[PDB]
Amino acid sequence: KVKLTKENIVALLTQGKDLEFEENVAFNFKTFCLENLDQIKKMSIISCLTFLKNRQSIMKVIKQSDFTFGKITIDRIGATDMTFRRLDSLIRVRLVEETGNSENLNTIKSKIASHPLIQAYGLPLDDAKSVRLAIMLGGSLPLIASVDSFEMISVVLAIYQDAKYKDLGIDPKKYDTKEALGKVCTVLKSKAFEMNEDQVKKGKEYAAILSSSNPNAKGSVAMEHYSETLNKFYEMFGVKK
Amino acid sequence: VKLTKENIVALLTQGKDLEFENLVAFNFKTFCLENLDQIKKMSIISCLTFLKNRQSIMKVIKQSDFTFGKITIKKTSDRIGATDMTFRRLDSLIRVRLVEETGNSENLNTIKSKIASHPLIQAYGLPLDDAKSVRLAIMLGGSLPLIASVDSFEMISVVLAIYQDAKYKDLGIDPKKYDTKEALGKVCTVLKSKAFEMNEDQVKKGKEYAAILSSSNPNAKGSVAMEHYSETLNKFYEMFGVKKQA
Amino acid sequence: SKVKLTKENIVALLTQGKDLEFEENFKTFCLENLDQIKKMSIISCLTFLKNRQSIMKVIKQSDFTFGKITIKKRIGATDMTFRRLDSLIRVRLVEETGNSENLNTIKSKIASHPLIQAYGLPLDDAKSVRLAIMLGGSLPLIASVDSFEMISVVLAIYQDAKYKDLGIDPKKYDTKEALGKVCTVLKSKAFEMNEDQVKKGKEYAAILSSSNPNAKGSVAMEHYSETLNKFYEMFGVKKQAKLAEL
DNA sequence: TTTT
DNA sequence: TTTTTTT
DNA sequence: TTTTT
């Protein structure tokens, strides 16, 4: 029995030797969060929301080459290392904190109505919890779930994305929506997180806003615009609209 | 500011408030007007072959960067430009090209004969008598949201979209692979975006197509299980007790 | 007129006014590179299967090179891919079940693999062990190797039927598409299922029928199975109820 | 607006 | 519903 | 514990 590594896999396939892989250190993002979060709080709240909006756009440019910003620069990742998903996740955790201040919250909610991911969910933007979910959308749920009080909002969003992946236009091949939820629970069990009635009810408040979201708007305002004519064709075919 | 690497380093390193912009506004009708001439250089028999072998042809194109003539599919990733050529954009051009040829008697006759053996055809039990019926056949399997933006193709798109929506069970359409409500929903967005109005002429035109669809004899399945294989496959489903055959 | 479907033929289809038609091997790939994999230990092979998913991520980490062979992660017909490696090893392992002593080693070791026991597959004879080697493999690839046709397509059907019981996610693995691809392979080699091949298939199907399938998602999701299911049903149909006070 |  | 990181 | 819509 040998530790599962990259150099062992090349030897597995090239040698007549009998090899097995131990399976059975430890990275904590919450601990990582406590460190680098102070550094991201020096970012402007506006600079953070631009990051969320251009996430995929910013990502492609960063992946062009070794990307260096300040003293940190973004294939086995060390526990102190900064990753794009880790940068994204810090920025999201940071922003949720600002939803406790009314002045920042108004700017966030208003600007947060203009995200590409937002409106696609058709998520209602009413209270602070409504804003936090918007900040949550598109983030690395396995990472963020490890931060305290972020456990339920993470696993709740994970299930909704798993359930409604079609409506949300989520390609299961591009994004494994089951695996994501599977990973979240792995993280919660590592912190021995237990889901009590308070956490579950807290989750249900989160869950409510997600049910009230409307994943497809444009396609449902044009259909009703032509519904008089559309329904006349429905009727000729089997069933009556 | 324009999105660059130096603006991103300033986003993360400065207490300054920064902004940048994302996707490309695309209009298939314009794309069609441009690239349709390049597709007119294909043989009509070659076009129907493309349609008949759609899935097979796609996979080969998707193996690598595919270049033909001036056109290149550029494989995938980095999103898609409004000027760029895609497989679906290619497929839809070929269908649009074919539908125009239905104004010609000799061409109408060759297509009608050649397209009668396609797998998607026969699955609909579509009768091929007149020109309008043949257009519907060319239409089958095509990207209705793309083709609908092209002039005069609005009604045939939305009527077929609704029919697929009503008869999606009879047609053996998997709701997970193809959301038949979403598809109709996209077509109307396209029609509404060009301010298409359904007057009595268009509605009357729509009904001419719809008539052809009621008279059609829709058939589920029509997959790649041989007439030699259907008999043996279902014995095993029954062995697992999961066959509905009788 | 009728031509083989290739990349140069598709360019000729689109760029030439000539009339072209089509009208429709890994086995060859198998005969070549399998000898490279035969130097592996049978135990090393079973380690590969057991640790399939984990090893894959390490391989997908970068361009993976072992011996003369390298996995990039475009693909040549001769290039080696992860699935091609996995399928080679599974074919290799099936050959070794023709030897009684090796059959014991495989039977003993593979009895502890996660996919087995999830199937609740009983391990008695050689044919039972082959099905065990078969689990999780690429059915369309392995189907192209001779004499692997029936075990491939029978297992493909069992999975299409029992995907619910096996805890198989239709989103991650299209259980119909897989079956569809296997038959496509059989038709491409013009495979015929006579009474004997079906009799052979029925022998396999029997063993899968005698199996008792029990699957649960990973380790942690089963630990949280009681609380998790409560959340799925709240996102069922459509509901917008808010909860106000006065 | 994509290997539907 | 052959080629891919498809439980 | 990664460029996962």
Give domain limits for chain A. Answer: 28-216
Q: Name the maximum alpha-carbon separation found in chain A.
A: 73
Q: Residue A206: CB partners within 8 Å, gap ≥ 6? A: A129, A133, A152, A153, A156, A157
Residues in A touching C65 (Cβ below 8 Å): 10
CA–C1' distance C14–D2 (Å)?
22
Query: In whole angstroms, how far apart are CA B132 and each of B103, B116, B135, B148, B187?
Result: 10, 15, 5, 16, 20
Between CA A232 and CA B211 the distance in angstroms is 12
Closest CA to B51 of C96, A223, C13, A39: C13
CB B162 within 8 A of CB A237: yes
Between CA C229 and CA C236 the distance in angstroms is 11
Residues in B touching C152 (Cβ below 8 Å): none
Whether chain A has a CB inside 8 Å of the CB on C221: the answer is yes
Closest CA to A51 of A64, A38, A69, A66: A69
CB B81 within 8 A of CB B25: no
Between CA A57 and CA B60 the distance in angstroms is 30
Strand partners, C66: C69
CA–C1' distance B96–F1 (Å)?
50
Experimental approach was X-ray
- Please give the resolution of this entry in Å, rounded to 1 decimal: 3.0
CB B134 within 8 A of CB B108: yes
> Using the beta-carbon criterion (under 8 Å), do B69 and C15 form an inter-chain contact?
yes
Positions in chain D where some atom is under 7 Å from a protein CB = 1-4
Nucleotide nearest to C24 (CA to C1'): E2
DSSP letters spanning A147-160: STT-HHHHHHHHHH
CA–C1' distance C54–D2 (Å)?
29
Residue the block writes with tokens 């919250």: A105
Residue the block writes with tokens 């003369």: C68
Residues in B touching C14 (Cβ below 8 Å): 39, 42, 46, 50, 68-69, 71
Between CA B102 and CA B135 the distance in angstroms is 7
Closest CA to C149 of B234, B239, B235, B232: B232
Q: Which two tokens stand for residue B108?
A: 């109408």
Whether chain C has a CB inside 8 Å of the CB on B109: the answer is no
Query: In whole angstroms, how far apart are CA A126 and each of A50, A112, A123, B201, C244?
Result: 21, 11, 9, 46, 13
Whether chain A has a CB inside 8 Å of the CB on C219: the answer is yes
Q: Residue B27: CB partners within 8 Å, gap ≥ 6? A: B82, B149
Q: Which two tokens stand for residue A238?
A: 């089997």
Between CA A174 and CA A187 the distance in angstroms is 22
**Which residue is nearest nucleotide E6, judged by alpha carbon to C1' distance?**
C173
Whether chain C has a CB inside 8 Å of the CB on B113: the answer is no
Q: Which two tokens stand for residue B201?
A: 């002429």
Between CA B233 and CA C165 the distance in angstroms is 20
Q: Which two tokens stand for residue C163?
A: 């995907």
Q: Which two tokens stand for residue B126?
A: 């579509």
Between CA C200 and CA A197 the distance in angstroms is 55
Between CA C206 and CA C61 the distance in angstroms is 41
3-state helix, strand, coil in chain B (%, to 5): 55, 0, 45
Q: Which two tokens stand for residue A68?
A: 């260096």
**Which amino acid, residue A239?**
V
CB within 8 Å of chain A, chain B residues 198-217: 198, 203, 206-207, 210-211, 213-214
| Minimum-distance CB partner of A18 among C44, C54, C65 | C44
Closest CA to A122 of A222, A219, A214: A214
Between CA B88 and CA B147 the distance in angstroms is 10
| Minimum-distance CB partner of B162 among A57, A216, A234 | A234
CB C157 within 8 A of CB C134: no
| DSSP run (H or E) holding B71 | strand B71-72
Q: What are phi and psi of B67, to 5 degrees?
A: -120, 125
Q: Residue B178: CB partners within 8 Å, gap ≥ 6? A: B168
Q: How many CB atoms lie within 10 A of CB C60?
A: 12
Q: How many CA atoms lie within 13 A of C175 on its CB side?
A: 19
Q: Residue B166: CB partners within 8 Å, gap ≥ 6? A: A234, A237, A238, A239
Whether chain A has a CB inside 8 Å of the CB on B78: the answer is yes
Minimum Cα–Cα distance from A215: chain B residue: B182
Whether chain A has a CB inside 8 Å of the CB on C232: the answer is yes
Closest CA to C107 of C89, C93, C119: C93
CB A180 within 8 A of CB A162: yes
| DSSP run (H or E) holding B24 | none
Strand partners, C69: C66
